[PDB]
Each structure stands twice: as C-alpha cells, then as structure tokens.
Design an enzyme around this catalytic site. Structure first.
Site, mmCIF file in Angstrom:
data_model
loop_
_atom_site.group_PDB
_atom_site.id
_atom_site.type_symbol
_atom_site.label_atom_id
_atom_site.label_comp_id
_atom_site.label_asym_id
_atom_site.label_seq_id
_atom_site.Cartn_x
_atom_site.Cartn_y
_atom_site.Cartn_z
ATOM 1 N N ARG B 218 0.812 -1.208 0.000
ATOM 2 C CA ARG B 218 0.000 0.000 0.000
ATOM 3 C C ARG B 218 0.847 1.260 0.000
ATOM 4 O O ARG B 218 0.379 2.316 -0.433
ATOM 5 C CB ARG B 218 -0.933 0.012 1.202
ATOM 6 C CG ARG B 218 -2.326 -0.465 0.911
ATOM 7 C CD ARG B 218 -3.116 -0.496 2.191
ATOM 8 N NE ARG B 218 -4.429 -1.092 2.008
ATOM 9 C CZ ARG B 218 -4.663 -2.397 1.998
ATOM 10 N NH1 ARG B 218 -3.681 -3.263 2.151
ATOM 11 N NH2 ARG B 218 -5.893 -2.839 1.836
ATOM 12 N N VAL B 219 2.071 1.188 0.508
ATOM 13 C CA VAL B 219 2.982 2.310 0.344
ATOM 14 C C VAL B 219 3.439 2.401 -1.107
ATOM 15 O O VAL B 219 3.452 3.483 -1.705
ATOM 16 C CB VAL B 219 4.153 2.181 1.330
ATOM 17 C CG1 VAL B 219 5.175 3.248 1.078
ATOM 18 C CG2 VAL B 219 3.635 2.286 2.753
#
Ligand code: ATP
Ligand code: ADP
Ligand code: MG
Ligand code: MG
Lengths: 177, 281, 210, 277, 365, 70, 52, 105
Positions: B218-219
């Site tokens: 998700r980063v």
C-alpha cells in the site's frame, strides 16, 4: 523393367516388416472401386457404363448407349465395345444419349478414357449443362479476348485458350437442335 | 514488486511450508549487510518473535544468526510450544516493546511476529478457559483488537518525536490457501501490504513463492529504491501480461508471435525473481 | 468419543491364545456410506479399527455384478496367508488378472482402439467378473469355489462367450466327478495328482457355450 | 475455500456446455461437408483403373504429403497420420531414396518436425478456412511439381462413416519417369489405348499425372476435412462425458461442504449460547 | 545428519534427520502403520541404540503382531536373555479408556527420556498415532466443563500437544529420533490436531489416499511431504537439485491434470507430453516394495540406497530412460531393476503358449 | 423463466393470453435448452438456429420500462 | 478482478448501481449510453468463458 | 401424521383391512419435529436437524407395517432439500422406503 511389382497386396506384406505390427494396413484407392479396366464384362449389348465425373459432382454413372466426346482432333463417338482410348478433350459438348433423348453438357476440357472392359470415364473440370450459359457474354468477352494480345506467351497462351473456348461455346450455342 | 518502507507493516501470509520464515530471515540477515555500510543513525535493529514454535526450531535460528552475524543486531523473543498460553499471547507484545525502544529513540526497528496465527490460538485458549464466550471458529470477539492493538504500534514517527521507525512483518499461516479465515482476514485488513506465498508456485521452482498477482504494497512506489522504481514498473507491467496468456496457451490452441513474446519474456522475469535460501542481494 | 464407542466394541473381536482356550470371534461391522463418500467420519473411524474392508459399489451393483465388490479397494491383510491353500494357489492369478482388467478399463473406457492383447485381458477379465458374481442365499463350499475359479483363471471357459458363464460354472460344478471335491477339501490344496485329475476332468465338461 | 468449489463447478459447467456446443457444431459441419466428399470420390476411380496402385516402387525422388487439420480439437487424428507418415515412409526405404515430406494443415507442421525435420520442405495451411476448391488443390499440386519427384504419396483419413476413418496412402507416379516403366509386362498394358492427344503420349501422361495429382490432393484434403469434423464430434463427445463426471464429483463434494458448513456454524452458535446460559 | 531409510520417496524428497521429529500423516488406510513398520525394519537394526515403541490408541492385534515379530527377529529376548533386548513396548491401545490413551504417550516418552538423559545414548521412539493422544484429551475435556474450541476439540490442543512434543527432542547429552504416525480425521489435513502437529516436526511425510488408489505404495504425496533437510548445504547440491527437479516435474503434471482429464492427452504440447510421460514414470518410480508388505503382497521388498535413488531419479529426469514404458518403474527397487523388468515385460510379450502337451499331469506320470 | 413457476399456474391466466403464453413458454424452453450456443453464429445449424433466433426475438419482447405497466 | 487487470478505479460496472440511473432523472442520452455500455460489458463476460 | 396413523391403524387392527396412508410431504413431518426439538432447547445434530431425527422418523414409519390382521401401505411424498440425497432427512427417510415412484415432467 518392372522389377518392383507393387500393389495393395505387396505393400501389405512388406509393411508388416518395417512398421510396428499393431498398426493396421493403410487403405488404398483400389479398395473402393469394384470396377477395373482389365476385368472383362460390364458390356451387355448396346448400353455401356458412362462415368461422367467432375471434381465437384458426379453428373452421370448409369449405362448409356452412345456418347459424343469432343476430342482434340474433333468430335468422336463411343458405342458399346469401343477400342481402348485415352482422349484429351477440347472444350465442347459431351452428348449423353439413351435413345431419342439427349442431354448436352458443355465441358471445359479434360480427358476421357475408354477402357478394355467398355467402361468410359469422362473426366472434366467444369462440366455445365448448356442450358445455363448465356449467349450474350460469350461474344462480349471474346471482343476483349481478341484485343489484349501481348508478347507474353503465358498470357498469349491464356488468350489462345480463351478465344478457343469462347469460340467453341459460341459455335455450340448458335447450333442448337 | 511489493516494496516495503520503514514504518510499514507487511503481512507474510502463506500456506503450511512455503517460504514464510525464509522471507523474514532474509529481511533480518540483510539488515546486517546494510548496517555495516550505512551511518549509525539509519541502522535497522531487528526483533524476531517466535510464537508457538519448537524450541529447537528457534535454536536453529540463533545458530544461523550467529554464524551470519545478524545476532549483533537481533533480539529473539521465544515463546515456544511448551510455554504457557499466556506467555505466547504476550510475547508479540513483549517483542513489540523491545522494538519500540528503537522507534522511540530515533533509531529504526524491524519486528517479525512469526505466526500471529499461533498467538491467536494461545489467546483463544485463555479466553475459553476464562469462560469468555466463543465466537467465530471459537475465537473471542476481541481477536481483531488483539492484533490491531499490536500492529498499529509499528509506525514511522514524526521528526519531533525523533524520526524513528518500526517495521512489522506479521506471519499468518493459512490452511489450504484459504485466506478467508478469521485471523487471516483480520490481519489482511490491518496491515498495509501482503506477501502472499503459494504452495503451487513453490514446487514449480519459483522460490520465493510470491503470488505476484495477489501480493500488494500500500505504500507502493512511495518508498522503494528510485533506481528500481523506474525498472520494476516495467517488470510488473509485463508480469501482469504474462499471467492471462499462460492460462490460454497451456491448452495448446494457437500462438501469435507477440503473445509468444509475452509468455517468453515473462518466463525471463519469473526466473529472474527466483533466489537461493540465505543470500540477500 | 464416537471413535471409542466402536473401538471398544470391535476390539473384543479377537483370536485368543492357547492358554485362554483358543477361541475366536470374527466381526463384520457394516457401515452405510452416503454416495460412496469413504472419507466420512464414522466410516474412516471404523476403517482404522478393522483389519480390512469390503467395498460394495453402486456402479457395480446397478450393472448386476453382485456382490458388487470393489476389488481395487477391498482388502483383508490379516486373513491373507491364512486362507484356503488351494484357493491361495488359484486366486493370486485371479487378483492379478482383475488388476490388469482394471488397468485396461482405466485406459479405455470407450471401445475403439483394440490391441488384441488388450482384447485378451478384456475378455479374460469379463470372464472372471462373470465368474465371481453369484446369487443370493446360497453360499458355496470352498472346494467348489476353488475348482470354479481354477476352471476360469486357466483356460476351460474361453469357449463360453460372456453370457453363458453363469450356466458354464454350474455345468462345471455339476459335471465334474465329485470325488475331487472330497480330495480338495481333505488335503487342503490341489496336489499334482489332483491337478492332473482336475485338468483331465475339466475337459469332459459340456459347456453351454458351443 | 467453500467459494473455490462453487466457482470450480462454474468452470466445469461452462466447459461442459462449450464442448457440447462444439460437438453439435462438428456434427453440423460433418453432414454438410459429406455432401461434397462423396461427390469428389468418383473422379479418383478412373485414374486408379487406368494407372493402378503402386505404393512400394523404387523412386529416386519422392514427395510424401500428410494432409492434416488446422484446428486442434480433432482428437488424435493428426497424430495417427504423423505415425502412419513414418510407418509408410520407412517402407519406402530400400536403397537410400530421397524423400521430401510436406504437410497440409497447421497441425502437421508442428508434428512432422519432431520426427522428420531435415526432410521437411513445405507447409500448406489455412486451407479449410473458407472451403476446399479444385483450383486450390491445383496450386498445391503446382508447388509440389516445382520440384519434380518420381512418385507422390498422400496420407490422409478416408471418411468411411462418423465412426471409422481408416487412413489412406494414395500413390501418384511421374509420367514415364516411373509410371509406364511400372506398366510394361510382355509388352505393355498402356498400349491398349489409342492416344488421341495433340502431341505424343509422353505429354498426355505428363498432363494426365498432374490431373491425377490434383484430383487425389483435392479428394485427400476433402476426405480429411470430413473425417476431422467427425473425429472432433467424437472427441467433444468424450469431453462432455468427462466434464459431466467431473461435475458430478464436484457437486457431491460441494454438498459435503455445504452440510459441513451448516453443522460447524451451528456448533459455533450453540457453543456461544451455552457459555452464557 | 541424514537418516537413510531405504525408501525412495522418503530419502529423495523429504529426507529424515537422525535426531529429528518425523511425522507420518495419513487418513485411515493409506499405510502409515506399514510405513512405520518398514521404518522399524530398515532403521532400527542399523541404528545401534535402544528403541521404544509407544503404541497409543491403535489395534491390540497390531501390538501382538509387533511383539511376536520382535521375539522372532531377536529384538526382544525372553527369559534370562532379556537384558540383550533392544526395544521396550508401551501400549495404550484403542480398547483402553480415554484417560489411559491420553497418558500412555507420556509413559513411552519417560522410558525414552531415561535412555536419553541417564544412559546418555540414542533412542528410537516410534509412536503409532499420536493423534489418539489428542482425541483422548478431547473425549476427556468435554466432561471437565470446558468450552469447546474448533471443530470439537479442547481449548488446550496446542499446549497439551506442544507440552508432549517438546519433550521429544535430542539434547546435548543424548538423542531421540522420533517417528510419529499422525492420523488425519476425515482425510482433512486442515483439522486442528494435524494442523497443530505439523509445526512440531522436522520431516512431515504426508500420505495421500489418491496416491494409494493408483496402486502407488508408499502412498506418499511428494508435493506435500517436506523436510528441513532438503537444503543444498545439508544434503549436497546433487541430491537437492534432483529432488527439486522431480518436484517441478510432478507439480507441472499436477497443473496439467485438469486439462488431461477433459481434453485428453491429444490436446497437449509436445513439451507437455514429454513432462506428462516423465512425470508418470517418476510417479511409478517413487513406489517401492516393502519387506514388511511381502507377507500380503507376495513381492519381496527392496532396500534402495540413497546414492542409487539420486542417480536413478536423475536419469529419469534427464531423459535417459524414455525408452522404457511406464509399468517398468512400478514396484521396483532401483534403476537396474527398471531395465530388468523392462526386458522381462518385453520378453513376455511373445511367450504365452506351449503348455499344450508334454505334461507331467497325464494319467500315468 | 426457468426457475420462476406458479403452482396455481394457467388456471388463473387471462384467457387469450393463455392461448399464446402456452406456446410462448414452450418456445422459450426450447430456446433456453439451445441457449449459450448463440456465440456460435458462424457455426450454423439451420434447425436450432430458428428457435435460437425466435428465442432472441421473444426475450426482447418481455422487456418493460419501469412504472409503465401495460 | 478489475484491480488485477490494472483498471483503476476498479469499479465493477455491472455490480455498481445507483438510484440516479433512471431516464427521467438523468435524461435519456445518459441513461441509454450507460445501459448500452453495461450490455456490451455483460455479453463480453458471456463471451469471455469461450475466448479463454 | 400420528393422527393419520391412528385412523389407519384402526382399519388395520379392528377392521382387518389393507389400508393406504398418504403422508403428504414426509419432509415437512421431519421439519416440524425439528422445530419442536429446537424449541424445547435441544442441541441440533447434523446439518441442522433434531438429534432424535432417526427415532422421530422411525417412530412414525415402524407403525406402518403388516400385522397378522391387515396392513398399512404408506405412500409418502418426499422432498429432497437442496437437491441433495445425502442430506440427513432424505437419507434417513430412504432407509425406510421400499419403493420410489418418480413422477417426471
Ligand atoms: N527461497 C527459497 N529457496 C529455496 N528453498 C526455500 C526458499 N525458501 C524456503 N525454502 C525451503 O522451504 C522450506 C520451508 O521454508 P520455511 O521454514 O520458510 O517454511 P515456513 O513457511 O516458515 O513454514 P513453517 O512455519 O511451517 O516452517 C525450508 O526447509 C527451506 O529449505
Ligand atoms: N507399502 C505397502 N504395500 C502394499 N500395501 C500397502 C502398503 N502400505 C499400505 N498398504 C495397504 O494399506 C492398508 C492400510 O495400511 P495401514 O498402515 O494398516 O493403515 P493405517 O494407515 O490406517 O495404519 C494395508 O492393509 C495395506 O493393505
Ligand atoms: Mg516457519
Ligand atoms: Mg494404524
């Protein structure tokens, strides 16, 4: 001079030595023909079997009594116990007769064999009934076919075949009975 | 493909004997190789929490961290299978507290909770013996709060608080590739990324057995190497094209000289991402 | 404790030692299975208690092969090498021939590719599975089963096609001189003199397939 | 894991209707292409009752054709032809004769190269896309005449019925390069016929064997197409059988999982309620 | 260090550790008692220590079988020769109440731990069905007033099982090589007792019923059996590369089987046909006759050395034995016997007759 | 239409509609049996293609347009 | 499934509904193009089991 | 169903007849007894049924028999719950059935 007398039977015997033995013998085109040339008979008087064939049809296979074939020397006729013949046909009308009634197929050319057992196998590519040609387009096309006359003998030979087929079609369509 | 930033929690989820520990041991051994080369401020101190494992399984890891040298930077919190059920429930919190020392004082930590799915079985045992009423599969109601209390302690702090960081790697074991379980769907919902390891990819030779179609970060492109941000954008763009064409071409219908290119190129990339056991590159 | 329910039940089926009298107790537990699911709970409980299994299939029972014994799955390892010695001399070939029949029916469930040696093992397997199927409420003595499967695992029945085997084995039991049943029962196995008289007696048998 | 099984039932059921469609498609194509196959069966007969059937003749140069299918669900038709290719191509081998192998159909291009790769020269393909015409077989005969062997072999499957396609090798010899040399016995059998050509007999046989090659190649790739459609109709017949028995196994196992799901959720609910009361 | 068992699939794909916990996972009739008896016959004679057989929750008939066959082979000696015995038996078989079957594994452990801790030497502990320990505590736990855990088990499954399993180790003063049969309850490898005991073992040999129904014995699932020894720094790169290549071929065939069952093998690639043929050959080659199975199979058993296993499986991988059929590999020892059986099957393709006359069974012989 | 039934059935139908719905549901049953093969258009069958074409006609008949009841 | 193709936002076009999809609310030129787009994406999904 | 059984058992045992009993939807008998077992606070057995399913069904079906006086022949309509014949209500009913007559559309 004929030291390899092959056939279905010899290929069956030799093929059981080099192929694996579980494989059944491949079939041959002989296995679907009951009629041969040297097998005497199939004559029965006046009517003879006329195998008028085509790549895309079988136009006749029943016995007829006289066939007019358009060979390259000229139109000839076949009665029952005719001489064996391998006749190349020019574009002309193959006439099948059974009596007074005549069906007129105009063909494109291609060979016509008469065998020793009296079977005749007319073998042509495009074998149209002369009903389904129009009399207009033939001279309409021959007027152009008498124009494009190049030095290219491929195209000139195609033009020769064109004018000869079209001329035979014209001379067969004006001369109806 | 699924890069990991400092302060990110990343789930290593997989089936029974995939490469789950081997991904996490390679993340710890690699920090030893980087700590010799970075300045003192950006060194990552690792903590491996071993919950519910064998005691000789964790003795094989202390022997591996010694003969590599990663034990200079590693804490091992070992609540084995013979320990009491409150010692295995509480050992991820003890290891998080030992690793929050480095987060709170401006350094960087790396915590690995090996089998959070074995911590929740230790939590279910106490909850069922304290007569707390059971819920899904038998688990207590607060078993989401069990893990989200713990994984939210992995953070990248602000520069007022020191700029420190704590990176988590919870490990969850599934049963048959069934990520729809209770504890599995909780930790998938908590953590940022997901490293999904497949047992069918493991035996095809692809080791690490990473399902590149299901593994997320998700980063994402925010905290990867800029030298590989511009290369591994193309890598996942091609491997996405590899996947659907091989579903068709294993039937053996027909091939198309550019469909032939993408399942021949994606085989160059699949073999490229293979790796040996204890050699982080 | 539904495992313990059946385990403490079936463990009393024992063969006692000679100091305890030498008595025995043979158990036949029966477990109905739902749609052939052998992986059920009570089924896999009793399978891991008993010394073997006799699997009876619906696909063999609907076809009329009765008893519908799944030979690839049925097993009895404690009773093996403890069976009738003449039947043990004959039936290893029967187990092997039904094994190869199962192999070539596992290869060709549709009939178009015939090796003519695969056709042989198909014809022998179809002869034997017609031999083993029998009728209800009429059990056979073991010497009349030994001779009946001796006449099938050898030749002596390939004249009969596939239908008349049920009458062929009845003709074999009827027309064989009944002294050889007494010698096979008393001796325990087929002696070579009895094998000679048995090969002789299975040639003067009027098979209904002629 | 209970939704993996429901979507696997979905996959097997859609496969089982796809293959049932393709079975009816192959059956539809088999009947309206049998109306063109036994029409062209007649013209092969005058050439065999004129020239005879000489498969095992000691050719110097030989072009063997294995005409196979283009699409691939035919079910072991093309592999049977690929094995009869070598089974009839080793029975020619008596003196170290040259052989060119040629495949008609895309699925022969991939399969003869595994067995005979140095003796491969041509792949005719996309032949059954629109239909098969005699001008097409004429052009294929032309490119088989560009290099001019002493014999031709055509391997195909004779469409007997929708059940049997027992494969066929048909043989075509170059005009007097070997054909009349195979005809001369105490004289000859070809000398019974009056050649009514324009030019000599050596040119009427030159035209006549190209016409025989065109006819045999046309009939071969027409019979092979109809036997391909019937082989696919018999191949997708077993595919729906397999996708029905796999579906039935999967439906039984889904029923087990459904029952176990209801029981386990019920045992969870009862254990939750009993820990309060 | 590796423990050679003489079993092809065990030594190749999930090799055993000489001081390791070994688990045999199976589903009621797949062959883990026959595997544990073959491991006894192969290992417990070369291994010169003492053995403990802790029979937990199994058949009393099998305990009598093992006791009588150990008296026959002299492992157990009766009377005044009793001190020269090598095995001690502890039995809590399936007629016992649940409290007896829940503690008898601890009795067998205590007998093994004396020899490990006090005599200071190597022990072999074979436990037939350590699942019955968990099942017995699950029978007991209902009546103790506990809220039940998942499927029906005690809340303390992991900790009871782990407290029993963590005693079964090798320490610095002695060794215990442990072989535990593990039962899976309804062929369900996700049941909590097998899934809990998977993490306690160094080598987990999972037996499948689908492998057994193809006639392949031992019915070891090769893509589900693991070890910590399958590591090139432990077994050598030759062994490891052969094992991983065998697993790659088998997994590729497993991915092809869904197509093969529907579209047949006629739709496959030639590469796919090659891997299906090779994988069928290495599936049959993993099967092996056992010396303890020969009393009911009739085929004498073969002990296949590890070097022969590695060399034979490498040859079948590279394509050295594509000339041989599939059934030449079935139930043979090593690759010499594949070629012997492949000559013999081919040889018997002709010899089927000439038992017509010239008998010893006519009337006056 | 295959799963929607009425155990009362056509005894409570509009007569006149009962004259035409009785063959409508048979035509739609034949279309549903030959359905999902309409992706084979180039692969035509000339007896099931008629019921497939008419079933595609009739499924387009029974569509309506949201609070305009007829 | 829409997200693994790389279509982002991974909105399921068939499964996403609104009460603003009436032609008397958003007009007919919007309603019929939305319903046509949905019909083309639906019979593509019915073809997609045979493309694969 | 027990009331219909009692009416049939009078004709069997007093009138001496060959009675016909029609239990319309034996599955609804099963489902009703399952509801009264759930309402009396009993733990449900497999899939969701009463723990006494085999005996609550066999208490009805074993009174349908031939006595020395007469007989009761029972024609029971059977509903199969999820088109699943291994569901415990039809699997328990099919142990008692002596014939099926499947009516087909
Ligand atoms: N990248 C890799 N390359 C080769 N082998 C690997 C790799 N990763 C793991 N393995 C092998 O796979 C086996 C399982 O690895 P690992 O111990 O990580 O399993 P796991 O997922 O932790 O499961 P468990 O927690 O049950 O042990 C190990 O023995 C290791 O040798
Ligand atoms: N190696 C083998 N060879 C032949 N048969 C075997 C083998 N292993 C298992 N079997 C068959 O499987 C059956 C069950 O094996 P067993 O070990 O008794 O079951 P369990 O796994 O339940 O203990 C045995 O009776 C035997 O017939
Ligand atoms: Mg691990
Ligand atoms: Mg056992």
């Amino acid at each position: 001079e004929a030291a390899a007398p092959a056939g279905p039977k010899e290929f069956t015997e030799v093929w059981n030595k080099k192929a694996p033995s579980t494989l059944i013998v491949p079939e041959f085109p002989s296995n679907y023909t009951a009629v041969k040339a040297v097998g005497e008979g199939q004559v029965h008087g006046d009517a003879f079997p006329v195998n008028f064939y085509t790549p895309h049809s079988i136009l006749s296979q029943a016995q007829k009594d006289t066939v007019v074939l358009p060979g390259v020397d000229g139109y000839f006729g076949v009665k029952a116990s005719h001489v064996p013949t391998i006749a190349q046909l020019k574009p002309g009308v193959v006439e099948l007769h059974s009596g007074a009634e005549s069906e007129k197929f105009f063909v494109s050319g291609g060979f016509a064999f008469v065998h020793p057992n009296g079977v005749t196998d007319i073998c042509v590519l495009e074998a149209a009934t002369l009903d389904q040609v129009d009399p207009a387009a033939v001279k309409s096309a021959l007027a152009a076919a008498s124009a494009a006359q190049p030095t290219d003998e491929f195209e000139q030979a195609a033009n020769r075949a064109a004018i000869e087929l079209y001329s035979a079609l014209e001379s067969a369509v004006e001369a109806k009975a | 493909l699924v890069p990991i930033g400092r302060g990110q929690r990343e789930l290593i989820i997989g089936d029974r004997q995939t490469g789950k520990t081997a991904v996490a041991i390679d993340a710890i051994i690699h920090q030893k190789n980087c700590n010799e080369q970075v300045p003192k401020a950006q060194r990552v101190y690792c903590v491996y929490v071993a919950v519910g494992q064998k005691r000789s399984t964790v003795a094989q890891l202390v022997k591996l961290f010694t003969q590599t040298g990663a034990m200079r930077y590693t804490i091992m919190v070992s609540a084995t299978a013979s320990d009491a059920a409150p010692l295995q429930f509480l050992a991820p919190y003890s290891g998080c507290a030992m690793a929050e020392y480095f987060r709170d004082t401006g350094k960087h930590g790396l915590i690995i909770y090996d089998d959070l799915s074995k911590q929740s079985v230790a939590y279910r045992q106490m909850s069922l013996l304290l007569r707390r009423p059971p819920g899904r599969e038998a688990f207590p109601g607060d078993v989401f709060y069990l893990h989200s209390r713990l994984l939210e302690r992995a953070a990248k702090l602000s520069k007022e608080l020191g700029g420190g960081s704590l990176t988590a790697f919870p490990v969850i074991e599934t049963q048959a590739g069934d990520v729809s379980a209770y504890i599995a769907t909780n930790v998938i919902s908590i953590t940022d990324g997901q490293i999904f390891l497949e047992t069918e990819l493991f035996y095809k030779g692809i080791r690490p057995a990473l399902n590149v179609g299901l593994s997320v970060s998700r980063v994402g492109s925010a905290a990867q190497f800029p030298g590989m941000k511009q290369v591994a954008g193309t890598l996942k763009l091609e491997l996405a094209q590899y996947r659907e064409v091989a579903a068709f071409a294993q039937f053996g219908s027909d091939l198309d000289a550019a469909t032939q290119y993408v399942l021949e190129r994606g085989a160059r990339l699949t073999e490229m991402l293979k790796q040996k056991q204890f050699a982080p590159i | 404790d539904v495992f313990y329910l059946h385990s403490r039940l079936l463990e009393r089926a024992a063969k006692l030692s000679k100091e305890l009298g030498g008595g025995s107790l043979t158990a036949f537990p029966v477990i109905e299975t739902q749609a052939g699911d052998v992986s059920a709970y009570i089924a896999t409980n009793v399978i891991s208690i008993t010394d073997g299994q006799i699997f009876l299939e619906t696909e063999l029972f609907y076809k009329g092969i009765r008893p519908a014994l799944n030979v690839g799955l049925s097993v009895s390892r404690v009773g093996s090498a403890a069976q009738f010695p003449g039947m043990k001399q004959v039936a290893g070939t029967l187990k092997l021939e039904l094994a190869q029949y199962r192999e070539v029916a596992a290869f060709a469930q549709f009939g178009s590719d015939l090796d003519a040696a695969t056709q042989y093992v198909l014809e022998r397997g179809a002869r034997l599975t017609e031999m083993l199927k029998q009728k209800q409420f009429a059990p056979i003595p073991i010497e009349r089963q030994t001779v009946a499967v001796y006449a099938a695992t050898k030749g002596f029945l390939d004249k009969v096609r596939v239908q008349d085997i049920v009458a062929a084995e009845e003709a074999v039991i009827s027309q064989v001189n009944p002294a050889v049943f007494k010698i096979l029962k008393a001796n325990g196995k087929i002696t070579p003199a009895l094998d000679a008289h048995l090969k002789a007696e299975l040639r003067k048998v009027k098979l209904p397939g002629a | 894991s209970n939704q993996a099984v429901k979507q696997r039932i979905r996959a097997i059921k859609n496969i089982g209707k796809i293959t049932k469609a393709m079975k009816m498609v192959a059956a539809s194509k088999m009947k309206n292409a049998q109306i063109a196959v036994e029409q062209s069966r007649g013209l092969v007969d005058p050439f065999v009752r004129l020239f005879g059937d000489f498969p095992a003749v000691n050719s110097n140069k030989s072009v063997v054709v294995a005409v196979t299918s283009d699409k691939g669900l035919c079910g072991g038709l093309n592999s049977n032809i690929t094995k009869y290719t070598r089974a009839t191509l080793a029975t020619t081998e008596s003196e170290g004769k040259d052989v060119v192998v040629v495949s008609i159909g895309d699925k022969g291009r991939s399969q003869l190269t595994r067995i005979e790769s140095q003796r491969y020269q041509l792949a005719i393909a996309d032949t059954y896309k629109v239909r098969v015409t005699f001008g097409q077989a004429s052009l294929i005969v032309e490119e088989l005449i560009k290099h001019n062997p002493q014999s031709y072999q055509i391997l195909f499957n004779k469409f007997r019925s929708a059940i049997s396609f027992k494969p066929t090798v048909a043989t075509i010899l170059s005009p007097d390069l070997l054909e009349k040399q195979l005809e001369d016995v105490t004289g000859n059998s070809l000398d019974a016929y009056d050649i009514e050509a324009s030019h000599e007999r050596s040119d009427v046989l030159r035209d006549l064997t190209e016409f025989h090659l065109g006819v045999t190649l046309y009939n071969a790739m027409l019979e092979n197409n109809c036997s391909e459609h019937a082989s696919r109709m018999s191949a997708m017949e077993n595919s729906t059988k397999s996708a029905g028995e796999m579906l039935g196994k999967l439906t039984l196992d889904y029923n087990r999982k459904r029952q176990a799901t209801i029981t386990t959720e019920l045992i969870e609910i009862i254990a939750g309620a009993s820990a309060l009361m | 260090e590796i423990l050679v068992t003489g079993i092809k699939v065990v030594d190749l794909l999930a090799p055993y550790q000489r001081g390791g916990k070994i688990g045999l996972f199976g589903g009621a009739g797949v062959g883990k008692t026959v595997l544990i008896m073959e491991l006894i016959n192969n290992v417990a004679k070369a291994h010169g220590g003492f053995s403990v057989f802790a029979g937990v929750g199994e058949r009393t008939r099998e305990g009598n079988d093992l006791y009588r066959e150990m008296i026959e082979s002299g492992v157990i000696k009766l009377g005044a020769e009793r001190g020269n015995s090598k095995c001690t038996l502890v039995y809590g078989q399936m007629n016992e109440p649940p409290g007896a079957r829940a503690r008898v594994a601890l009795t067998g452990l205590t007998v093994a731990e004396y020899f490990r801790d006090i005599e200071g030497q190597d022990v072999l502990l074979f436990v037939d069905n350590i699942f019955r320990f968990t099942q017995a505590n699950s029978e007991v736990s209902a009546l103790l007033g506990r809220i039940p855990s998942a499927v029906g088990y005690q809340p303390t499954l992991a900790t009871d099982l782990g407290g029993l399993q963590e005693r079964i180790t090798t320490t610095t003063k002695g060794s215990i090589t442990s072989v535990q049969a593990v039962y899976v309850p309804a062929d369900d490898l996700t049941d909590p007792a097998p899934a809990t005991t998977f993490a306690h073992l160094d080598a987990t040999t999972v037996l499948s019923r689908s492998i057994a129904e193809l006639g392949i014995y031992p019915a070891v699932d090769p893509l589900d059996s693991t070890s910590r020894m399958l590591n090139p720094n432990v077994i050598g790169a030759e062994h490891y590369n052969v094992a991983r290549g065998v697993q790659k071929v088998l997994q590729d065939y497993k991915n092809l089987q869904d197509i093969i069952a529907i579209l047949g093998m006629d739709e496959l690639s030639e590469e796919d046909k090659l891997t299906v043929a090779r994988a069928r050959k290495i599936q049959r080659f993993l099967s092996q006759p056992f010396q303890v199975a020969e009393v009911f199979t009739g085929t004498p058993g073969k002990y296949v050395d590890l070097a022969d296993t590695i060399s034979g499986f490498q040859g079948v991988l590279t394509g050295k034995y594509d000339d041989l059929p599939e059934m030449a590999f079935y139930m043979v020892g090593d690759i010499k016997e594949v070629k012997e059986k492949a000559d013999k099957m081919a040889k018997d393709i002709a010899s089927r007759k000439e038992a017509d006359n010239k008998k010893v069974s006519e009337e006056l012989k």
